[PDB]
Amino acid sequence: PQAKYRHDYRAPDYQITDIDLTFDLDAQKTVVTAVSQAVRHGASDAPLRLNGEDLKLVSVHINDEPWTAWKEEEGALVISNLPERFTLKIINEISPAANTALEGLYQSGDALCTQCEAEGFRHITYYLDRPDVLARFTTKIIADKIKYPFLLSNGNRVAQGELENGRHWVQWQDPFPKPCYLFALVAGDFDVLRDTFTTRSGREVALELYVDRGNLDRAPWAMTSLKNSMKWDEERFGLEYDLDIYMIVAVDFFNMGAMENKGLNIFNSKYVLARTDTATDKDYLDIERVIGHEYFHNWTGNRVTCRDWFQLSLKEGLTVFRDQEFSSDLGSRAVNRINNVRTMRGLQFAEDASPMAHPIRPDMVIEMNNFYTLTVYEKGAEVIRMIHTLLGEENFQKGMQLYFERHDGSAATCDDFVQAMEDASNVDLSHFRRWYSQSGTPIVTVKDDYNPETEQYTLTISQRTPATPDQAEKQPLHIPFAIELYDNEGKVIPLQKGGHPVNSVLNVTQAEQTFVFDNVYFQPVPALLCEFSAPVKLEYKWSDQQLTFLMRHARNDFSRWDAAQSLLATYIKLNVARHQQGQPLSLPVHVADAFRAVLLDEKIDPALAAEILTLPSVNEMAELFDIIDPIAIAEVREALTRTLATELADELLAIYNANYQSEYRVEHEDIAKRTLRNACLRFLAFGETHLADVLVSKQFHEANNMTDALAALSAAVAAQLPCRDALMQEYDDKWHQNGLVMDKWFILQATSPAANVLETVRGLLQHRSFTMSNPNRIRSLIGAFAGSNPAAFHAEDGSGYLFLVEMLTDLNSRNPQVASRLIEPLIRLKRYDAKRQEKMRAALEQLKGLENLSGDLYEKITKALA
Ligand SMILES: NCCCC[C@H](N)CC(=O)O
Ligand code: NA
Numbered sequence: 001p002q003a004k005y006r007h008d009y010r011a012p013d014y015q016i017t018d019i020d021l022t023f024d025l026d027a028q029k030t031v032v033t034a035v036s037q038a039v040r041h042g043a044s045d046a047p048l049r050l051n052g053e054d055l056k057l058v059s060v061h062i063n064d065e066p067w068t069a070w071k072e073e074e075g076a077l078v079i080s081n082l083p084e085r086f087t088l089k090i091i092n093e094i095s096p097a098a099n100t101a102l103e104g105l106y107q108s109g110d111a112l113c114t115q116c117e118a119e120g121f122r123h124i125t126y127y128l129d130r131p132d133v134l135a136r137f138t139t140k141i142i143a144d145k146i147k148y149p150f151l152l153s154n155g156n157r158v159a160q161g162e163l164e165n166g167r168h169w170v171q172w173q174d175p176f177p178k179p180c181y182l183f184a185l186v187a188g189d190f191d192v193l194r195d196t197f198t199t200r201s202g203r204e205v206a207l208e209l210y211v212d213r214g215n216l217d218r219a220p221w222a223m224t225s226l227k228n229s230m231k232w233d234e235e236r237f238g239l240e241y242d243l244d245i246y247m248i249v250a251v252d253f254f255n256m257g258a259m260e261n262k263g264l265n266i267f268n269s270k271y272v273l274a275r276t277d278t279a280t281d282k283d284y285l286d287i288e289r290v291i292g293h294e295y296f297h298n299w300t301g302n303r304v305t306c307r308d309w310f311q312l313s314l315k316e317g318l319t320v321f322r323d324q325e326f327s328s329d330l331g332s333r334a335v336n337r338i339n340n341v342r343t344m345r346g347l348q349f350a351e352d353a354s355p356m357a358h359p360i361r362p363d364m365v366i367e368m369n370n371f372y373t374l375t376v377y378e379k380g381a382e383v384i385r386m387i388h389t390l391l392g393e394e395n396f397q398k399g400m401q402l403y404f405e406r407h408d409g410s411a412a413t414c415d416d417f418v419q420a421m422e423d424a425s426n427v428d429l430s431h432f433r434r435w436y437s438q439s440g441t442p443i444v445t446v447k448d449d450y451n452p453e454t455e456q457y458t459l460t461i462s463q464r465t466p467a468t469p470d471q472a473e474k475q476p477l478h479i480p481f482a483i484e485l486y487d488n489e490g491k492v493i494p495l496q497k498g499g500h501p502v503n504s505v506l507n508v509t510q511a512e513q514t515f516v517f518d519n520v521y522f523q524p525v526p527a528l529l530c531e532f533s534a535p536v537k538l539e540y541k542w543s544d545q546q547l548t549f550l551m552r553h554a555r556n557d558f559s560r561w562d563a564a565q566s567l568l569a570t571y572i573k574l575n576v577a578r579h580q581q582g583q584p585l586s587l588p589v590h591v592a593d594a595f596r597a598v599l600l601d602e603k604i605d606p607a608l609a610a611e612i613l614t615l616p617s618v619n620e621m622a623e624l625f626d627i628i629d630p631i632a633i634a635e636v637r638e639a640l641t642r643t644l645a646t647e648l649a650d651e652l653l654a655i656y657n658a659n660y661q662s663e664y665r666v667e668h669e670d671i672a673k674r675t676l677r678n679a680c681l682r683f684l685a686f687g688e689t690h691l692a693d694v695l696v697s698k699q700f701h702e703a704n705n706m707t708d709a710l711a712a713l714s715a716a717v718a719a720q721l722p723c724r725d726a727l728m729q730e731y732d733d734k735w736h737q738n739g740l741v742m743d744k745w746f747i748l749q750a751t752s753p754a755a756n757v758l759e760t761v762r763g764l765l766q767h768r769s770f771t772m773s774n775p776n777r778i779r780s781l782i783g784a785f786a787g788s789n790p791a792a793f794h795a796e797d798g799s800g801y802l803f804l805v806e807m808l809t810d811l812n813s814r815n816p817q818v819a820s821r822l823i824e825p826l827i828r829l830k831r832y833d834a835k836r837q838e839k840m841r842a843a844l845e846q847l848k849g850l851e852n853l854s855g856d857l858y859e860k861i862t863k864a865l866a
């Protein structure tokens, strides 16, 4: 399998302007007829090279003439001796029932549906399966009436008919030209929720949400979220929807979260279906986010698409930024920012140090589905957010307007986006472009000095990015470095120099520089890299009392939470080294006191308190170390939780009872109170055993909503309470028929700290609610074990790796994309000790040797063993 490189991009020899598709649908054998209008742009003797995979070619015509000048090659149909403009007609067969990869046209339960991003359209017919080729689609679908009463594709329904033998047909037409990755087709039987949204200029859009029969009671929240998305995009970005219909279809068998197909989004039902007894606050907020995200792609992705796949972050970074802004405007900005920072530092940083490291605009790709990454998405969004930070909102919106003005209707580049932002703002971003092309996490080192003679504060800031496996050369970036300076009383010291105000966003552009501030009347406590103003590691030698001061005084909530993270970080490192020598947890009293003060501050937003009382995850903790000891980290996380539970027991219980709510509402204040309450319950579960068992058991049985119930069950599992087995059995008994709900239970099983967790997980491969044919179940049991139980996955005997190898040996043949998700924990071997490294390398060497090794695995395994 061959690498492709960004520097090889060339404009296509041929374009296609219009394509007319006809599907004669059947699960064993679907006949596709594709009639394309084509235009040559290159040399007169260049053949047309069409992409195609696993297609049975039936015929090829050019202007109605059967064509003899062609041949098949590996992955292609090459057609020679063409005129300058012509009609290509291809007829071919495909087999949806055989498609376990879930790429192209496949079967989801009894429905037929498509997934075409990145390069799945080529599994449907021979085409220019590349996103700089944009065409107007017309799609006609013919199918059995009983099995497939609903026949959907992009755009508007323009024709309809009945045929002999219980078949029917519909035709659809989408007026906007599109790359084929945005093609969708859905056939099946559904319940439908219908609603409308009226845009700000008075267009009435019909909204339609298709779900499995019986699930209409779980549809309204998604519908509500869609309307909220449409409204927000209008208020914030000035963007309206551009068609009279918007369809969403929830399918159960899907590789990712969702897909922005124009006018016809297809969603993993996990990000659509919710009811108060089935879904958590977090589900409600995730459904909102993903609905928003796919909607926001309608402009940032569809009306302006990507010239080639190396430009993915042009749509994904910008769209992720848009979903974060949406969630933050509607909810708590502080909680959003915090959690996104947790994700960046805890998960994306690890990727940017891994063998899979790449810039947000990659230079080399073997399997493009491997690059739908935390880097491309979350670091991508951080890069967009840095642009926003440098330009300010008003200039950033001008840049948006200019990007659309220049590029609407076309496929664009990351470089085109940056250029629009520069031209609209007159801010120079030449050096800033280096964030698109350099991989890895910059390390920013800060040293300070207060001069009492001159009332000057001096910051000396340096940066460097370490080499990564993809890139030996690294250079300084344009790092927006936001600061605030606090005086003795907790008030902000105006920033200034030589009698003039200076911007609190510093431009850190060199390996090293110095900034000097005048009229610093008291020795300050700095807040550094405010709001995580650049996606970097901060190295700065804080005192605990500077950090508690920031926890008590900083003006942004984010800085308080972040000061609390810096405070724990010292003690996490300390106690990990202790654990390794057999020594128990040590924690200064004043640290415990700083958390006690948060529990009892009544001014404090309960959402902030809950974040500060949610300890860094094992993945966030692991970012603190070069070599990771996953067993020591897990045990320290537990011991710290036990220690705080004991020191704060009274305050914990009181805040728990105070935040009781009788009514359940999906509303920002209610969520915040409940999140705090359940953060208290978590500690309490790790406290005195009898009271823990009582509290947890009681919350689980009396809960009127899944958030309160799952928090209890989760706490019983995590603290291994006596009530655990009973509670777990009750939830199985009640919920076994419901896969999305069972996923949560599989996650708890997989992530259990119990000594026999691997054995329990193996047995759960036979559980009535598990199947290897469903990506959600797979991720919930197997993925959650490998990726979210690092202590068990990295058991000293290597049983964890061996289990994953067995699973991947199945999944490589069945569903390579899911396989490639699941291999990620093994790809990180170079963060572990020599003994673990040897075993992980041996596991990877077995997988390298599979017959029919997928490209997806190949790419990762090769980079890992280098
Ligand atoms: N394997 C390709 C996954 C495509 C993801 C799609 N653009 C949905 C999203 O970005 O949210
Ligand atoms: Na075209």
Ligand code: NA
Residues within 6 Å of the ligand: 260, 297, 300, 301, 302, 305, 315
């Ligand atoms: Na798109």
Ligand code: NA
Residues within 6 Å of the ligand: 328, 329, 330, 331, 332, 333
């Ligand atoms: Na808000």
Ligand code: NA
Residues within 6 Å of the ligand: 542, 543, 544, 566, 567, 568, 569, 570
């Ligand atoms: Na510290």
Ligand SMILES: [Zn+2]
Residues within 6 Å of the ligand: 293, 297, 315, 316, 319
């Ligand atoms: Zn996206």
